[PDB]
Amino acid sequence: GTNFSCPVDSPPSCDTYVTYFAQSPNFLTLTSISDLFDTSPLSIARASNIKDENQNLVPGQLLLVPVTCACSGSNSFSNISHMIKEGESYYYLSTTSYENLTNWETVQDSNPNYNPYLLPVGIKVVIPLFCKCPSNYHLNKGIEYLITYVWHNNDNVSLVASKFGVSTQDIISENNFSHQNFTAATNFPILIPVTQLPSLSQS
Ligand SMILES: *[C@@H]1O[C@H](CO)[C@@H](O)[C@H](O)[C@H]1NC(C)=O
């Protein structure tokens, strides 16, 4: 499907964004998400068109979190050093906290020396988010960012496309959605290509 391999021709590191949605158990503050992602709340608010940094986020509200993304071998990642809180697994952390922007596998692959369930509260575990950075061909098109977005079984391209202000075809071809198996109930990361940061709806 979508290849998350380091472009051979374009720089190894870059700035893009990953998509995160407000979650009603705990992540309904900017503070929640900034602590989850190690960035300032204003950077998120600026990237998400939020004009008041103190307003609560409504459940499911779309947000763009700026991340800096680099090469770790032949694949692109953006690592977040997350400190362990009480009762957190790799699986929990990566399917609810980080909202499937990373799978348990790659996490415990770049976090050796550890027991995936005996995590002592207060240890640094690096959470490699998925991200790609513009190939040379991306940049010659005018693409400024490949935003990470977690495709679920429920999304349809027209809604997401109008949300990010792109064509359906842009999404479909960037992710080779023309022979891609949505049968699998899996969630998988994809890349929205955008010529500029989009002007997200107000709530
Ligand atoms: C898909 O998005 C379009 C955009 O307007 C909408 O009309 C439609 O109801 C959505 N759902 C589908 C096609 O299942």
Side-chain angles (χ1 to χ4, degrees):
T2 321
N3 47 347
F4 280 80
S5 50
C6 273
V8 285
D9 39 41
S10 99
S13 88
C14 38
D15 295 354
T16 54
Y17 311 80
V18 304
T19 307
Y20 194 86
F21 297 91
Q23 258 163 322
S24 181
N26 316 80
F27 311 76
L28 302 124
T29 76
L30 270 194
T31 325
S32 52
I33 288 133
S34 35
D35 300 351
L36 197 58
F37 285 91
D38 224 328
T39 191
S40 87
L42 175 60
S43 54
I44 294 164
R46 172 162 44 244
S48 319
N49 221 11
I50 321 160
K51 271 132 210 211
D52 188 306
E53 286 186 41
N54 301 339
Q55 193 165 349
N56 281 21
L57 318 164
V58 278
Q61 157 157 5
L62 202 152
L63 302 166
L64 292 185
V65 179
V67 305
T68 168
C69 164
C71 276
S72 178
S74 77
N75 275 91
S76 298
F77 287 110
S78 152
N79 316 63
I80 279 65
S81 100
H82 168 86
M83 210 185 72
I84 297 284
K85 298 181 30 59
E86 66 291 353
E88 284 186 334
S89 38
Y90 293 174
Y91 181 84
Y92 173 86
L93 264 201
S94 47
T95 78
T96 37
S97 278
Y98 289 93
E99 238 170 79
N100 287 324
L101 291 163
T102 196
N103 43 43
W104 56 273
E105 303 139 282
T106 36
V107 178
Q108 53 159 108
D109 283 35
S110 44
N111 269 175
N113 305 316
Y114 280 79
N115 176 289
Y117 315 81
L118 184 31
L119 296 170
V121 169
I123 51 162
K124 304 248 213 86
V125 308
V126 316
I127 303 280
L129 313 177
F130 298 120
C131 60
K132 203 172 35 164
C133 296
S135 69
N136 199 35
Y137 302 166
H138 284 105
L139 278 159
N140 295 3
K141 268 330 196 182
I143 313 294
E144 209 174 292
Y145 300 113
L146 303 171
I147 304 188
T148 308
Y149 185 99
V150 162
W151 198 266
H152 321 256
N153 281 210
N154 326 63
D155 314 82
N156 77 342
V157 281
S158 35
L159 293 175
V160 159
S162 156
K163 207 133 51 194
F164 280 84
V166 296
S167 92
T168 41
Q169 280 307 329
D170 291 343
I171 301 185
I172 287 174
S173 36
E174 183 51 33
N175 298 281
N176 274 313
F177 266 16
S178 35
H179 34 285
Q180 156 86 43
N181 168 303
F182 305 97
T183 84
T186 315
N187 287 352
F188 49 95
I190 73 162
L191 299 173
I192 278 75
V194 289
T195 167
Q196 53 165 237
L197 191 70
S199 267
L200 295 195
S201 152
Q202 262 86 38
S203 148

